[PDB]
Amino acid sequence: FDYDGPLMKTEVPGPRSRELMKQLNIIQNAEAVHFFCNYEESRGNYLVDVDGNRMLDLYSQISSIPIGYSHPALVKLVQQPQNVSTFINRPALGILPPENFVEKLRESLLSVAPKGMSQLITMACGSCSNENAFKTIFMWYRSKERGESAFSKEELETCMINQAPGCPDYSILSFMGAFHGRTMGCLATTHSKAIHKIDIPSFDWPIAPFPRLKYPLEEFVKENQQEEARCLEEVEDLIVKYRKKKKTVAGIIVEPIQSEGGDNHASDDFFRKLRDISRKHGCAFLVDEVQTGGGSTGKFWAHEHWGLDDPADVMTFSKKMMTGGFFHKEEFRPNAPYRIFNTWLGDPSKNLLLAEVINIIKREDLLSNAAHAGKVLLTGLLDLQARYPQFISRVRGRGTFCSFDTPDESIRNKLISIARNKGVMLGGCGDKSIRFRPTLVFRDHHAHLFLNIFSDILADF
Amino acid sequence: FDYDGPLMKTEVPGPRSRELMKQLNIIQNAEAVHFFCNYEESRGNYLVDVDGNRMLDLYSQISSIPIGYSHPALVKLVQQPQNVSTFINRPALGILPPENFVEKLRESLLSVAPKGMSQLITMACGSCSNENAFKTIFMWYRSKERGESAFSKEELETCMINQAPGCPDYSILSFMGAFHGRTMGCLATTHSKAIHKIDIPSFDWPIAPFPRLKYPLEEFVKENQQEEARCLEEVEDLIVKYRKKKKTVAGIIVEPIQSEGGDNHASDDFFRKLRDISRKHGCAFLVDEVQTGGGSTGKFWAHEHWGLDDPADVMTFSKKMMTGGFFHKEEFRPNAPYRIFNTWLGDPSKNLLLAEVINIIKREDLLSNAAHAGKVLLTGLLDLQARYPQFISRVRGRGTFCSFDTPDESIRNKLISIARNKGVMLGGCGDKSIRFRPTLVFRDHHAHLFLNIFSDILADFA
Numbered sequence: 069f070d071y072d073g074p075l076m077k078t079e080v081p082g083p084r085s086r087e088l089m090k091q092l093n094i095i096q097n098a099e100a101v102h103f104f105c106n107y108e109e110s111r112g113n114y115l116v117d118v119d120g121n122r123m124l125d126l127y128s129q130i131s132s133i134p135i136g137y138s139h140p141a142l143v144k145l146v147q148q149p150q151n152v153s154t155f156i157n158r159p160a161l162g163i164l165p166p167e168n169f170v171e172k173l174r175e176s177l178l179s180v181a182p183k184g185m186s187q188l189i190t191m192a193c194g195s196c197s198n199e200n201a202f203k204t205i206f207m208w209y210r211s212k213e214r215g216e217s218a219f220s221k222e223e224l225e226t227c228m229i230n231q232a233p234g235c236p237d238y239s240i241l242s243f244m245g246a247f248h249g250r251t252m253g254c255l256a257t258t259h260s261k262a263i264h265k266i267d268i269p270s271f272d273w274p275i276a277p278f279p280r281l282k283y284p285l286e287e288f289v290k291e292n293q294q295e296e297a298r299c300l301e302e303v304e305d306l307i308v309k310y311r312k313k314k315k316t317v318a319g320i321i322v323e324p325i326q327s328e329g330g331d332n333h334a335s336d337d338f339f340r341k342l343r344d345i346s347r348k349h350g351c352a353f354l355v356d357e358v359q360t361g362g363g364s365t366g367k368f369w370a371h372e373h374w375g376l377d378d379p380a381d382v383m384t385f386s387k388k389m390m391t392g393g394f395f396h397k398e399e400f401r402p403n404a405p406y407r408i409f410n411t412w413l414g415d416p417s418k419n420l421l422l423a424e425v426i427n428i429i430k431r432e433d434l435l436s437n438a439a440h441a442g443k444v445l446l447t448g449l450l451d452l453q454a455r456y457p458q459f460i461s462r463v464r465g466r467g468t469f470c471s472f473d474t475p476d477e478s479i480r481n482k483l484i485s486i487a488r489n490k491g492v493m494l495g496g497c498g499d500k501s502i503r504f505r506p507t508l509v510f511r512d513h514h515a516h517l518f519l520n521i522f523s524d525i526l527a528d529f
Numbered sequence: 530f531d532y533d534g535p536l537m538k539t540e541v542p543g544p545r546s547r548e549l550m551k552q553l554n555i556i557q558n559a560e561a562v563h564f565f566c567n568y569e570e571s572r573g574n575y576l577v578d579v580d581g582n583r584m585l586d587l588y589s590q591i592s593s594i595p596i597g598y599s600h601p602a603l604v605k606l607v608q609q610p611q612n613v614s615t616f617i618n619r620p621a622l623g624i625l626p627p628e629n630f631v632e633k634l635r636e637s638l639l640s641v642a643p644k645g646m647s648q649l650i651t652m653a654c655g656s657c658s659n660e661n662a663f664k665t666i667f668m669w670y671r672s673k674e675r676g677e678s679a680f681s682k683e684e685l686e687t688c689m690i691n692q693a694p695g696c697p698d699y700s701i702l703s704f705m706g707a708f709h710g711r712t713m714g715c716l717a718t719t720h721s722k723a724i725h726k727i728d729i730p731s732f733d734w735p736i737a738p739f740p741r742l743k744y745p746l747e748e749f750v751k752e753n754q755q756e757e758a759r760c761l762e763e764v765e766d767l768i769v770k771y772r773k774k775k776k777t778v779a780g781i782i783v784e785p786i787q788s789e790g791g792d793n794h795a796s797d798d799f800f801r802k803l804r805d806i807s808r809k810h811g812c813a814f815l816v817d818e819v820q821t822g823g824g825s826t827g828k829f830w831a832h833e834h835w836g837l838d839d840p841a842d843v844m845t846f847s848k849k850m851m852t853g854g855f856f857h858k859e860e861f862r863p864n865a866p867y868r869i870f871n872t873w874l875g876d877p878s879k880n881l882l883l884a885e886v887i888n889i890i891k892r893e894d895l896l897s898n899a900a901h902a903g904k905v906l907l908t909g910l911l912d913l914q915a916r917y918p919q920f921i922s923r924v925r926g927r928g929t930f931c932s933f934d935t936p937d938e939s940i941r942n943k944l945i946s947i948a949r950n951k952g953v954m955l956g957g958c959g960d961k962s963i964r965f966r967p968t969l970v971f972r973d974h975h976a977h978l979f980l981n982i983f984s985d986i987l988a989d990f991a
């Protein structure tokens with residue numbers, strides 16, 4: 069189930085990784101590779117590289133490994149002769165689903181449906197989840213504006229040549245700092261880093277400011293309240309402005325916590341008010357839980373913290389859920405087939421794994437565990453913040469979804485590199501932030517393992 | 530390895546499928562579902578449904594199953610205890626690849642690299658393959674324009690808010706009848722059916738006509754070279770037209786054989802001439818082999834029939850290749866990391882399957898078989914086109930990648946329902962066409978078996 073603690077043999081990346089990285093660099097730009105891994109020996113919270121180093125993984129493959137490496141319940145799943153077909157016979161799910169398709173969804177995604185969302189469509193990643201959510205919303209908004217009336221074949225002629233009115237000028241509203249994926253629709257709503265965006269054609273869609281909170285939160289209540297109201301007002305202005313530009317906002321997309329943009333949090337009150345604005349202006353409210361979903365904030369979906377019976381119209385997911393997809397309200401159900409469609413629509417082998425994952429999360433009480441291990445981790449980070457204010461500021465988090473800021477990008481990268489050499493895998497976000505994305509089997513004792521290591525690092529820094 | 534004939538028991542969809550379909554229709558529009566399947570009992574070319582029916586599968590999951598259902602070598606893979614980790618520990622490939630990642634690529638995709646393309650990036654589907662091919666092309670074009678100089682301050686600031694100059698107004702040129710995927714970039718180059726495009730915002734990019742060939746090819750040689758020539762002229766006119774409208778064509782995307790648009794073919798000469806038009810105007814030439822790739826035309830990539838040493842700059846693939854991705858020339862390699870990137874970049878579990886799949890295609894010479902069994906197929910249809918000219922016209926194909934047209938939509942659908950009830954599954958492209966997408970273990974006698982069944986269907990048709 070897990071190892072005792074990290075065990076380091078070489079610097080990271082070590083010689084075998086550098087050689088493998090050299091080989092990979094022949095066929096593609098491999099500059100992003102951190103090191104090469106031995107997934108066969110990785111277990112629980114621990115990632116093992118090809119040089120025999122064993123690191124406590126607080127990054128979890130960009131927050132996509134739900135219950136650790138080589139989990140024995142998932143090993144057993146694959147060993148079962150009845151499951152071999154799921155792995156070698158991949159169906160075109162939208163036309164030829166396998167027999168157990170509904171029953172496996174009942175054991176997995178449907179058992180954690182968000183409140184008010186009866187509909188579910190599966191997708192293979194977070195980008196095509198969000199893209200097909202955009203299209204679902206565009207179709208819903210046009211269906212609002214046309215009744216009753218069928219497809220005018222002026223629309224049917226124009227749409228084949230990328231022309232109005234068949235191809236409308238609707239917009240999706242998004243937030244500075246957002247990250248929603250990399251295909252060209254998602255990218256327009258992404259506003260994280262210049263390197264993600266530069267040289268790519270885009271859409272003229274409204275971009276709103278995301279609240280920047282001041283820490284400690286308990287000393288800045290009035291100012292954080294004012295900041296959020298400012299952002300809410302600008303959101304509303306943009307909807308009216310782009311309505312007058314004939315670029316009508318059909319939906320609003322937001323992350324419950326902005327990840328790649330620098331772990332930007334906002335109050336539950338902000339999101340409830342934003343959901344209200346979306347309803348008021350007839351915009352679909354699209355909540356992207358690709359990164360916050362799967363339980364690390366202490367609830368299965370992070371938007372559950374908002375306390376709403378009607379939290380959103382559409383909610384997209386991926387990563388920890390193994391498969392992508394989106395839940396939505398019944399009124400967004402497409403009237404006709406083949407409008408939301410592609411070859412694979414996910415992968416039933418991922419659903420097979422996800423049903424066992426969800427069963428482990430529920431039986432091992434891992435939502436409550438994440439709330440607890442996260443409080444322990446955050447308490448420790450606040451302690452380190454008080455002891456090393458020249459290095460650590462803006463400690464923040466919900467559940468294990470935690471982060472802090474360092475002085476600059478150069479310092480962030482040195483600390484990550486040292487921590488890796490001391491047996492801890494960390495990830496970055498934003499300009500200068502260090503983020504924590506532990507798997508759901510991260511325990512309070514793993515928090516202490518990290519904090520002790522980081523204490524000695526900051527002492528010697 | 531295979532059954533030796535269809536085995537029917539009910540109409541299709543049978544009772545259990547209709548029940549499963551009603552259940553599924555509760556949580557999503559299920560109007561597209563044909564029937565539910567028992568893949569555990571499916572074998573080779575035969576798809577078994579939940580009502581016990583066994584049909585000859587000439588659609589192969591929209592042309593995505595490479596070597597038939599439940600192949601014993603793929604079965605033998607999943608049962609190796611060394612491979613368990615591969616299925617349950619999915620990495621973020623761009624940052625933390627597994628130890629065997631490069632070698633498994635050598636065993637698989639790299640051993641079928643097209644001519645002139647040393648670079649490879651993997652992706653999970655055909656849509657993000659083409660999307661990232663587009664972005665690779667846009668980055669390369671801007672790199673030409675800016676030379677070896679850094680991003681400007683104004684570019685870095687305006688790209689964050691969707692504005693020029695950071696976000697250029699480049700275009701990708703595509704063809705009518707093209708299908709390149711459903712995400713919003715892909716969709717703007719797709720021109721297949723109106724039901725794919727309506728109510729979705731798009732890009733003002735150039736759309737060129739694809740040549741509509743008259744058949745028999747024997748009889749219309751000069752009409753067809755004239756048709757192909759004027760299409761080539763409109764392509765060139767659009768590039769010139771969009772450069773002045775400050776929407777410079779950075780690349781051209783085309784399928785070697787259009788699929789979803791109605792199985793539109795064109796001569797090898799046409800693609801060679803289009804290849805040179807692209808180069809001549811400094812456009813990247815992007816060849817979409819998502820559907821044609823994998824060997825069904827008798828060569829692993831369809832474009833291999835063109836006989837070029839420089840067939841393309843970028844080539845995307847998916848479906849039969851299990852994983853997606855794209856090959857490209859070295860000069861298209863991104864200068865900096867994190868520009869072409871996402872969490873998974875495919876899936877090592879698919880690479881593990883593809884390596885065994887590619888070994889079997891070579892060891893058992895399935896490319897020859899596809900050219901051969903495709904000939905028997907196409908020969909048979911031509912005979913049935915002669916004996917029934919009121920139903921079947923324009924019998925075309927390359928390898929097993931064949932199609933034909935019917936008078937109208939209703940006869941198309943009726944023939945498919947009849948044929949499926951008689952034990953053979955066919956797909957349909959366009960408004961009134963019937964296509965053949967057999968797996969690569971489809972053989973001589975599977976041709977004949979379909980031919981004999983469709984024969985009797987033909988003799989009893991109203």
Ligand SMILES: Cc1ncc(COP(=O)(O)O)c(C/N=C2\CC(C(=O)O)=C[C@H]2C(=O)O)c1O
Binds near residue numbers: 194195323359871
């Ligand atoms: C809220 C959210 N929405 C959509 C997506 C898109 O999913 P896919 O990656 O499956 O297409 C993601 C994925 N997250 C990252 C991808 C990435 C990169 O540089 O591409 C850096 C990661 C990061 O979180 O910083 C995401 O977190």
Ligand code: FES
Binds near residue numbers: 251652655656
């Ligand atoms: S776009 Fe989601 S897997 Fe290709």
